[PDB]
Nucleic acid binder design. Sequence first.
RNA 1: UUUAAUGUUUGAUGUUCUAACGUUGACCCGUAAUCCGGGUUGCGGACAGUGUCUGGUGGGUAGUUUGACUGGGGCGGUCUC
RNA 2: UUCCUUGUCGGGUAAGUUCCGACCUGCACGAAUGGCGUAAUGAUGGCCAGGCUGUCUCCACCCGAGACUCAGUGAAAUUG
RNA 3: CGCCGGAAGACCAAGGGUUCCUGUCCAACGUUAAUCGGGGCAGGGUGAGUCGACCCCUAAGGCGAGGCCGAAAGGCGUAGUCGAUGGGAAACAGGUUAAUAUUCCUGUACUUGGUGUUACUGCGAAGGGGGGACGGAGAAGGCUAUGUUGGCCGGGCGACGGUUGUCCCGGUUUAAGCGUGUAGGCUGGUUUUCCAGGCAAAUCCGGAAAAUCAAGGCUGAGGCGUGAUGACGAGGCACUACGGUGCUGAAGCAACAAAUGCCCUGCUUCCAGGAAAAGCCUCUAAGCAUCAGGUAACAUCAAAUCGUACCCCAAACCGACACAGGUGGUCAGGUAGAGAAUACCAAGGCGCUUGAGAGAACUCGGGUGAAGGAACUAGGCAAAAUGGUGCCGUAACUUCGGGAGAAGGCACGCUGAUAUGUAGGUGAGGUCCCUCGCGGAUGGAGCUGAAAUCAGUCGAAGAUACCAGCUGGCUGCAACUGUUUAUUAAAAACACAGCACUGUGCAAACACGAAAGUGGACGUAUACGGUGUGACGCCUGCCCGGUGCCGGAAGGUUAAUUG
RNA 4: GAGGACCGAACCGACUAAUGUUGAAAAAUUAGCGGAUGACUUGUGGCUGGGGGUGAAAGGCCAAUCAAACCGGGAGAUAG
Lengths: 17, 46, 271
Amino acid sequence: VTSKWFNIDNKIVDHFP
Amino acid sequence: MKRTFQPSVLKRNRSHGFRARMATKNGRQVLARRRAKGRARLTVSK
Amino acid sequence: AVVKCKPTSPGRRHVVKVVNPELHKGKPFAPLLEKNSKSGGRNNNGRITTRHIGGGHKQAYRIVDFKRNKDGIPAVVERLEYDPNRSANIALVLYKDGERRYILAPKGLKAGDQIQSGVDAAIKPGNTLPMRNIPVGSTVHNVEMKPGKGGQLARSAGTYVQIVARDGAYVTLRLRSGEMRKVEADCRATLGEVGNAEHMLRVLGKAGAARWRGVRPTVRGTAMNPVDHPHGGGEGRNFGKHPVTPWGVQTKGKKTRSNKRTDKFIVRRRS
RNA sequence: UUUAAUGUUUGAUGUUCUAACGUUGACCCGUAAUCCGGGUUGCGGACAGUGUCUGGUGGGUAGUUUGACUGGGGCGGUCUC
RNA sequence: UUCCUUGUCGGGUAAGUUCCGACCUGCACGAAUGGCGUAAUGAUGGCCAGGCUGUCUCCACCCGAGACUCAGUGAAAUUG
RNA sequence: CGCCGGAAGACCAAGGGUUCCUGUCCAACGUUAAUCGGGGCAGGGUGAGUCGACCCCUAAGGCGAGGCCGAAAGGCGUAGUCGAUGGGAAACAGGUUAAUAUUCCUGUACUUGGUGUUACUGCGAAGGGGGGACGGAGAAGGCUAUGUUGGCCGGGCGACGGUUGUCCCGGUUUAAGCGUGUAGGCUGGUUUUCCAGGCAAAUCCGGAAAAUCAAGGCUGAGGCGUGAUGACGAGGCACUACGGUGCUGAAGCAACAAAUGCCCUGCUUCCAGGAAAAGCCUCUAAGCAUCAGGUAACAUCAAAUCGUACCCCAAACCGACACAGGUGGUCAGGUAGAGAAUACCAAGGCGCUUGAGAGAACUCGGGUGAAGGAACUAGGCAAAAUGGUGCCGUAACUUCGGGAGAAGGCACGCUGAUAUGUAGGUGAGGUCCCUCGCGGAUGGAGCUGAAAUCAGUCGAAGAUACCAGCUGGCUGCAACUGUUUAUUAAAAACACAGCACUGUGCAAACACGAAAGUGGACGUAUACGGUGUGACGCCUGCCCGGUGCCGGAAGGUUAAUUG
RNA sequence: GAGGACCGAACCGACUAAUGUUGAAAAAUUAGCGGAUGACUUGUGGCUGGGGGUGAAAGGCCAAUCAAACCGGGAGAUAG
Ligand SMILES: N[C@@H](Cc1c[nH]c2ccccc12)C(=O)O
Ligand SMILES: [K+]
Ligand SMILES: [K+]
Ligand SMILES: [K+]
Ligand SMILES: [K+]
Ligand SMILES: [K+]
Ligand SMILES: [K+]
Ligand SMILES: [K+]
Ligand SMILES: [K+]
Ligand SMILES: [K+]
Ligand SMILES: [K+]
Ligand SMILES: [K+]
Ligand SMILES: [K+]
Ligand SMILES: [K+]
Ligand SMILES: [K+]
Ligand SMILES: [K+]
Ligand SMILES: [K+]
Ligand SMILES: [K+]
Ligand SMILES: [K+]
Ligand SMILES: [K+]
Ligand SMILES: [K+]
Ligand SMILES: [K+]
Ligand SMILES: [K+]
Ligand SMILES: [K+]
Ligand SMILES: [K+]
Ligand SMILES: [K+]
Ligand SMILES: [K+]
Ligand SMILES: [K+]
Ligand SMILES: [K+]
Ligand SMILES: [K+]
Ligand SMILES: [K+]
Ligand SMILES: [Mg+2]
Ligand SMILES: [Mg+2]
Ligand SMILES: [Mg+2]
Ligand SMILES: [Mg+2]
Ligand SMILES: [Mg+2]
Ligand SMILES: [Mg+2]
Ligand SMILES: [Mg+2]
Ligand SMILES: [Mg+2]
Ligand SMILES: [Mg+2]
Ligand SMILES: [Mg+2]
Ligand SMILES: [Mg+2]
Ligand SMILES: [Mg+2]
Ligand SMILES: [Mg+2]
Ligand SMILES: [Mg+2]
Ligand SMILES: [Mg+2]
Ligand SMILES: [Mg+2]
Ligand SMILES: [Mg+2]
Ligand SMILES: [Mg+2]
Ligand SMILES: [Mg+2]
Ligand SMILES: [Mg+2]
Ligand SMILES: [Mg+2]
Ligand SMILES: [Mg+2]
Ligand SMILES: [Mg+2]
Ligand SMILES: [Mg+2]
Ligand SMILES: [Mg+2]
Ligand SMILES: [Mg+2]
Ligand SMILES: [Mg+2]
Ligand SMILES: [Mg+2]
Ligand SMILES: [Mg+2]
Ligand SMILES: [Mg+2]
Ligand SMILES: [Mg+2]
Ligand SMILES: [Mg+2]
Ligand SMILES: [Mg+2]
Ligand SMILES: [Mg+2]
Ligand SMILES: [Mg+2]
Ligand SMILES: [Mg+2]
Ligand SMILES: [Mg+2]
Ligand SMILES: [Mg+2]
Ligand SMILES: [Mg+2]
Ligand SMILES: [Mg+2]
Ligand SMILES: [Mg+2]
Ligand SMILES: [Mg+2]
Ligand SMILES: [Mg+2]
Ligand SMILES: [Mg+2]
Ligand SMILES: [Mg+2]
Ligand SMILES: [Mg+2]
Ligand SMILES: [Mg+2]
Ligand SMILES: [Mg+2]
Ligand SMILES: [Mg+2]
Ligand SMILES: [Mg+2]
Ligand SMILES: [Mg+2]
Ligand SMILES: [Mg+2]
Ligand SMILES: [Mg+2]
Ligand SMILES: [Mg+2]
Ligand SMILES: [Mg+2]
Ligand SMILES: [Mg+2]
Ligand SMILES: [Mg+2]
Ligand SMILES: [Mg+2]
Ligand SMILES: [Mg+2]
Ligand SMILES: [Mg+2]
Ligand SMILES: [Mg+2]
Ligand SMILES: [Mg+2]
Ligand SMILES: [Mg+2]
Ligand SMILES: [Mg+2]
Ligand SMILES: [Mg+2]
Ligand SMILES: [Mg+2]
Ligand SMILES: [Mg+2]
Ligand SMILES: [Mg+2]
Ligand SMILES: [Mg+2]
Ligand SMILES: [Mg+2]
Ligand SMILES: [Mg+2]
Ligand SMILES: [Mg+2]
Ligand SMILES: [Mg+2]
Ligand SMILES: [Mg+2]
Ligand SMILES: [Mg+2]
Ligand SMILES: [Mg+2]
């Protein structure tokens, strides 16, 4: 749960710093 | 791969059995709560 | 003798071993053995109370005679043996009445030599007397601190004590640390130094050689995180603080002795 | 005003002592027991150690604080008359 | 570890911001939070050559498993 | 027909618990249908003196009368008492059910107790001594399981050329026990006299002295004999309710090869120096002494209770699933091979619970490719290549070991001869000795059998398949083998041997605990703790002003207390 | 006949790439890769408990949960 591993993977998720 | 539950009835009883609950003051608190609630199986015994 | 191994492997290049051809090649004397289980540095609470201890080889305790209270009966050294529990070597001695015991082997002692204990014993290495019968200046070992209690000083390989002075009921000894101390003159001591004096010339050579002796690896405090040691933290290698033990007390210089009841026996602390 | 001699503490210091207290010294008994207790003796001894009070030290541990305005915030400047 | 900076000079390439050798103008190395070397070792970092090749010029054909049609069973995210 | 065969076969422990076997049913369950099923329903099935548990004995550890300690609850711990993953008596072969079998049946065995009779007699423990009783590696020697070939026995004479022979197919098995005592291994034997030792005693163990003897003893695989004129046995015959059931039954030998099993808890060596207690043997104490008790033979009785089906690399256990995952031990055939690798097979077991077509793009997994050959790309990523045995040959540098399998190169099939099968291994009959035996010497039948050389011969290719290093040059970092972010980081990070500083004199410092206590350590400064650095080589310069630590104590300031 | 020696299966690991990403699988498969007599690996049992343990040190691990586990309570915490 929470995943959807691509909603945890932070290259995919944290794309705009 | 290896999971977390590896059964063994010796350690199941030496940890959670009736005679292990009765051996300490807090173990006898657990048994008193399960009797008050009304549980059919008090402990993991047989 | 010390011998250097040849470098036929990276783990043999730096090994130096001490080989004594005159130790016993056989099983030890069974009646004087006991069981010695390890601890891992854990007390009766199950907690680690000394770090870097754990593993090693199985060992059997040899009941060594530190009191030497079999007075007046001569003994003959039967053999020299290996003891895993101490750095020195033990000897097996046979008394004229048929009793066998283990004693710490002094320097120069070999199979066939005669030893004796008591007030009438001769002044030769291996003999045990009260220290009021030992001439001043002598080099003694296996010294008692309280009469009749058994030897506690100068028990490690190559160590000894010097009787510096005698005054009434006390003698002044110079301990191996270079520290003067007064003991009662009715305490016993064995004449001579402890053997195996080349024990310090050995080189373990590899990291597994110290795991054979029951010593687990040490992690530097400066390589931890701040929650673990007071030295931890930082990007790159940072120290910027005074060295301390993992429980916060200052090391490198601070003095920890506080014993006011045995301070009367210290003539002079070491330097 | 100074001084001593006098008897006393009462303090301070020092040296002896033993009887409190310590003993993870030896021996004996309960006892079939390296716990404990009692006994005999040795060594220390009014010290050590513990309670109450007290000065110091104390990120070892804990609870918290670390302003606003602002052509985004920080940096700088300002904040009342 | 050097910002200026692809410093300059030499080597290697037809051509080399990387690599190797030097120089010293060290923004901002340096001596047990060690300095400088070092044989052997490393699923360690950089660079060069030989062999080898569908990596590529630049793709073509073939062999199987799906994709497609028939019968049977039969989901899911999502949705004013 | 295909697949596994160091398993995808067989047997267990753990775990599960009726999934086991028979009859019947097909609603739901089964990724489809189902007449089938580990599904529904009903019935049946688990047989022990010897296997396991229970039992006797202990390890780590637990609990713990008194005790010590703590506001209470409680903590620790002595005597004790539990606790196996370890020590302790005893059974094998064949037969049989649909389903159990070392449990039932047939044959042949063995163990420990009680009771009784007879004979002789010093018995007796909570105590003493022995024993149990113990590491890593290495090297063999002697064997066996097992396999292969030959002989023997039974059958065969071949769908298509040939096949009465140097031919083909199948079998050639037998245990525990009991008797003997061998290859090997260890040890000197016997008797007497004395003794500060073994908490007391001792005739036992330990020690001392003398005489005498050159042998004795302990242990020990295998073989042989018996067990066994038995059982089993290829087939044949007779029935079949077609699955099976009944009867009879030949030969049942030798040579060679050979274990990772056994002798072997041995032997040799090394350092890191390698459980405990009981069962067992023995010695006495108090005690008892026409007894009791002990030894032996015989007879008799007893050996209770619980497990036992079935699955166990799995559709039955752990993963929500009939889930490409995980799961300890035992067994271990053939042909090639060094091999438990790899290829093809045996015993045995399976084809993985949707199929049928077609033969588009694209995706996945593979094969081949003209000329070129890294031009691709962040980067030779990925692929291709190399790859075996024997011999020749091999640089810088080096800590003298290495580097190094450096690099590179040559030979390799089959047939014949040397030699009707050699060198080597094994070793019968026979002859002689004596020790008349599980012996020694000689001898060489038979069996097995590399490597090489010469000569010939086939292909494009002889390490033919599977299997099986790419290599070299310069350089940074870390000496090295290790460890690490289970599940995006394996590294230059952590560790490390070595080095230094520092604390610690033993009721040690130090750590866990209101404490008692415990670890450090049954250790003692050549030891122990902390800190930093990190093999080895050459080395490690100046600053004590700041912060810290160590020493000092004169003077200044300074708490409770006093008043 | 030594060795934290060498090559290499079982065994223990996890260096690369492709597949998969509502998977066959809440971390695997395929092909290669490392160690493989040791600071090894594994079975059965035991001990350490939450500001605590353990850690060849990564804030790693403590039942698919970790810069402070899980369960119940204070508790209907508080929320400009
Ligand atoms: N994507 C992979 C790996 C993965 C598992 N859990 C993840 C969480 C986050 C990122 C990746 C993963 C998978 O699904 O198997
Ligand atoms: K014993
Ligand atoms: K360290
Ligand atoms: K750091
Ligand atoms: K006293
Ligand atoms: K005091
Ligand atoms: K703006
Ligand atoms: K504004
Ligand atoms: K710099
Ligand atoms: K150039
Ligand atoms: K040029
Ligand atoms: K270096
Ligand atoms: K590496
Ligand atoms: K390199
Ligand atoms: K059906
Ligand atoms: K299903
Ligand atoms: K057992
Ligand atoms: K006895
Ligand atoms: K004797
Ligand atoms: K059964
Ligand atoms: K190779
Ligand atoms: K690695
Ligand atoms: K690390
Ligand atoms: K030290
Ligand atoms: K101890
Ligand atoms: K200074
Ligand atoms: K200073
Ligand atoms: K100063
Ligand atoms: K070897
Ligand atoms: K183990
Ligand atoms: K917590
Ligand atoms: Mg340490
Ligand atoms: Mg160290
Ligand atoms: Mg870190
Ligand atoms: Mg801190
Ligand atoms: Mg820095
Ligand atoms: Mg704070
Ligand atoms: Mg503060
Ligand atoms: Mg608050
Ligand atoms: Mg603001
Ligand atoms: Mg602004
Ligand atoms: Mg240039
Ligand atoms: Mg350069
Ligand atoms: Mg630096
Ligand atoms: Mg600096
Ligand atoms: Mg310096
Ligand atoms: Mg420095
Ligand atoms: Mg350097
Ligand atoms: Mg379709
Ligand atoms: Mg359809
Ligand atoms: Mg929605
Ligand atoms: Mg096959
Ligand atoms: Mg059922
Ligand atoms: Mg069935
Ligand atoms: Mg159906
Ligand atoms: Mg079935
Ligand atoms: Mg059924
Ligand atoms: Mg207790
Ligand atoms: Mg018991
Ligand atoms: Mg069956
Ligand atoms: Mg005994
Ligand atoms: Mg015939
Ligand atoms: Mg015939
Ligand atoms: Mg014909
Ligand atoms: Mg035949
Ligand atoms: Mg006992
Ligand atoms: Mg299951
Ligand atoms: Mg569930
Ligand atoms: Mg299936
Ligand atoms: Mg499965
Ligand atoms: Mg396995
Ligand atoms: Mg195979
Ligand atoms: Mg078959
Ligand atoms: Mg196709
Ligand atoms: Mg081409
Ligand atoms: Mg062609
Ligand atoms: Mg070509
Ligand atoms: Mg290019
Ligand atoms: Mg390009
Ligand atoms: Mg590659
Ligand atoms: Mg060269
Ligand atoms: Mg050489
Ligand atoms: Mg050379
Ligand atoms: Mg070569
Ligand atoms: Mg560089
Ligand atoms: Mg390294
Ligand atoms: Mg490594
Ligand atoms: Mg990771
Ligand atoms: Mg990755
Ligand atoms: Mg990784
Ligand atoms: Mg230390
Ligand atoms: Mg370092
Ligand atoms: Mg000071
Ligand atoms: Mg190795
Ligand atoms: Mg491997
Ligand atoms: Mg790992
Ligand atoms: Mg991988
Ligand atoms: Mg793999
Ligand atoms: Mg390799
Ligand atoms: Mg290997
Ligand atoms: Mg080891
Ligand atoms: Mg961090
Ligand atoms: Mg959870
Ligand atoms: Mg977890
Ligand atoms: Mg918190
Ligand atoms: Mg409230
Ligand atoms: Mg609320």
